[PDB]
Every structure is written in C-alpha cells, then in structure tokens.
C-alpha cells in the first residue's frame, strides 16, 4: 500500500535518525554556538555554509556530506552570480527542503538525516541569529533560541528548555550545552562558532587546548 | 518489506566477507605495515593508492580491484588538479564511503568487501599514521593502532589487541602480526610497507629473500 510504503519509509528514516549521535546548536551572545559529541577526530558534521552561514547535520555521514557539498556549490554559485551579501541561509533552507522532499518522494532509499541552518548578521550589523530546522521529508522549523539533533531528543531538549538563558557567553553557553548534552569529556567533542564579531567569515572552530580551557 | 531485502543484502555482504581471505594492516615505528595471506603470486589485495597513501581491502577481487582503480584515478586527478600534497587519504576514504553507500543503495548486487586506507606523514614530517576502515554499506571508522580485515576478525583482532606494542619495529610488528594471523609459511603471504622514511613514495612491497629474512 502507498500508505504502508510512506509509513515504512518514514519509520526507516526516523529509526536511522534515532540511531545517531546528538548535536545541539544555540544562538548565544556572540552569535550561534555549535556543540556536538563527535569522537571521530577527522569527520566533521558542522561546516561553514557561507561567510555568515554555518551548517550542522545529524544522520548518515555520507548523505549529509553530499548534501553539504551540493549546498556549498549552490551557495558559491549564487554569491558569485550576484553578491556575497545577497546570499541568505533562508535560500539554502528552501533549497534543502526542495531537495529533501524530492529525495523522499522519488528515491527508493531516502536520506535519514535531520539538519540545522544557522545564519548571523553581517559585521557591524545587529539581528537575531536565525535558526532553520529541516527534517528528512522537508519540514522546516525556525527555532528562536536553540536547535537539538540526534538520538533521544527529549531529555536534552527539556534540559535546555530549563537551562537555556538568552544572551549566553561562550563559556556560559558551552557549560549549559554540555550539561544538557550529558542527558562527556573534552575529547570526542566537536565544537565551532558563528561569530558575528568576525568581519567576513563568521564561522570559527575552537578545538584542543583552547577548547579544554573553555571547559 | 524493504527491510527484509536490506538486511538480506547485509547478510550476503558479511557472509561473502566472512568467507574471504584475511588481511591486516599495522602502523609501526617506520610507518604502516600490511600483511595479506595471499597464495596467489599475481593477485594483490594491497596496493599503493598514492605516494604516502596506501591500499588494502578484502572481498571479491574484481570488486575491490575496480574500487582501487577508480580511487587511484581519482587521486591522480586530484594531484594533477591542485598538487601532490593536496591528495589526503581522508578525502579518498570519503570518496570510497560515498561510492560504496551508492553501491549498497542502488546497485543490484552489493559489493561484499571491506576497505582500508592508511596514510603516513610526508618525508621529513612527524604525524601518527591515520587508519580508516570502510565497510560494505559505506561505514567509515578510524583505527588509532591497527585494522583487521577478512574472515573471522575476532580471534586475530583480540590476539593483536593483547599483543600490541605501539611503535613496534618492522621486524617486531611483522612477527606479532604473523603470530596473530596464524590464529603461516613465508610463501602465500604478501606484505608491503608505507615507509615514511621514503623521500616521495612511501609504499614498498616486500617479497622473496627479504621476506624470508624478516620471517
């Protein structure tokens, strides 16, 4: 049955989602914080989508790596075609929603990945950072405060609901994020920041000794 | 159900891999060491992927042979496109993972192989070897110490685990490797080394009288 087919497709997508590690992104004082428990010292699930646009994913690594690369290609094409500042992460979210709905409907095996899209204002520009939560089937959600991915979402999501404080510093945001995510040592963690205080490229990775000190 | 077919494909994959000849790779003091118990004097389950990038896999010989040839072509293309040093084995591991996931999802009879790639620092450069195991479904994992392919991985894997000594010499590494693998004769065994002490091409096969002398 087509109803049965859709139900089993959704079920396989969601079980692939649940059987995955967890990553959470939050909008903090300096921009958007990306915090993940990712032991893989070489595979990275968070990337700079564009100068003020970052990326995060939860699912099969090859799948969302392919999606990341395609979106990056399109974003660069858009920026070169018109302008760097004309590019918005909302455009990317729409594009990803189109692609994900497409792959869900036409492909035999869809991609069991959920994503987050974060954008920050330009340098010298004030704006609430924008979060876009897109699902396997193309359901996009805008999160005013924080975005929670991977595995058992409920415990960490509730903890953040009861621990998130708007205008969190790097240290405060990271302490709150790790406290919520425990629902782990500095190693086997992956973390980077979208810093609006960066002039052009807001994305920045904090790792190793500086990371440990921040913990 | 599609789950029936997918798990059937997985069972077929690891049954083909189980009834497959066992190869192991070790990172030792001088770089990376590979041992395959190959009776065939002509067939090579291990190859050089690039100057400091090595090849090793187990499964159906034509399958991983095709994969080796495609990956070598890709590495050559990348090196010509930008530079020799720009070829990192991590990229190749990603390419192999994506193509094997593709094979698993769309191609009718999935490949029953599991792949390994090793990387040493450039000559006159200090870095731990990087080991990446690639599964039939496309799963990638990184081994800090050793990787074991083919057949019953558990016995020899536990043997090396109990008998591993980091920074082991070429001779000590080969002795412990063959001791665990036996769980053989100088013949029917193929070995090669990713020698970081090589100026440009780290790869080096070891056969014949030297192979006897070390063993």
């Amino acid at each position: 049955s087509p109803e049965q087919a859709m139900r089993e497709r959704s079920e396989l997508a969601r079980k692939g989602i649940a059987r995955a590690k967890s990553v959470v992104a939050l909008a903090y004082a300096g921009g958007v914080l990306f915090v993940a428990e990712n032991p893989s010292r070489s595979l990275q699930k968070i990337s700079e989508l564009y100068d003020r646009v970052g990326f995060a994913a939860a699912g099969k690594f090859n799948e969302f790596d392919n999606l990341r690369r395609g979106g990056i290609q399109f974003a660069d094409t858009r920026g070169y075609a018109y302008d760097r500042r004309d590019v918005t992460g909302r455009q990317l979210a729409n594009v990803y929603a189109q692609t994900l709905g497409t792959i869900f409907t036409e492909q035999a095996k869809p991609y069991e990945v959920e994503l987050c899209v974060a954008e920050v204002a330009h340098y010298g520009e004030t704006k609430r950072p924008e979060l876009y939560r897109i699902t396997y089937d193309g359901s996009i959600a805008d999160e005013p405060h924080f975005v929670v991915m991977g595995g058992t979402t409920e415990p960490i999501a509730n903890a953040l609901k009861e621990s998130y404080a708007e205008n969190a510093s790097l240290t405060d945001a990271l302490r709150i994020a790790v406290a919520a995510l425990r629902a782990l040592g500095v190693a086997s963690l992956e973390v980077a920041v979208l810093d609006a205080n960066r002039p052009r490229r807001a994305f920045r990775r904090i790792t190793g000794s500086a990371l440990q000190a921040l913990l | 159900s599609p789950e029936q077919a997918m798990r059937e494909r997985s069972e077929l994959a690891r049954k083909g891999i189980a009834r497959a000849k066992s190869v192991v790779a070790l990172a030792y003091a001088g770089g990376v060491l590979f041992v395959a118990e190959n009776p065939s004097r002509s067939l090579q389950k291990i190859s050089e992927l690039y100057d400091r990038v090595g090849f090793a896999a187990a499964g159906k010989f034509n399958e991983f042979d095709n994969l080796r040839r495609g990956g070598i072509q890709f590495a050559d293309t990348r090196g010509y496109a930008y530079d020799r040093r720009d070829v990192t084995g991590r990229q190749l591991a990603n390419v192999y993972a994506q193509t094997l996931g593709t094979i698993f999802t769309e191609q009718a009879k999935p490949y029953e192989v599991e792949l390994c790639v090793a990387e040493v620092a450039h000559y006159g450069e200090t870095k731990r070897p990087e080991l990446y195991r690639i599964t039939y479904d496309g799963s990638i994992a990184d081994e800090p110490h050793f990787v074991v392919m083919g057949g019953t991985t558990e016995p020899i894997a536990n043997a090396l685990k109990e008998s591993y000594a980091e920074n082991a010499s070429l001779t000590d590494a080969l002795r412990i490797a063959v001791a665990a693998l036996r769980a053989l004769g100088v013949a029917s065994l193929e070995v090669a080394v990713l020698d970081a002490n090589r100026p440009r091409r780290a790869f080096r096969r070891i056969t014949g009288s030297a192979l006897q002398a070390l063993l």
Partner: peptide, 4 residues
C-alpha cells in the same frame, strides 16, 4: 552507512 555510518551514523557517527
């Protein structure tokens, strides 16, 4: 395919 890897989830991690």
């Amino acid at each position: 395919g890897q989830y991690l």
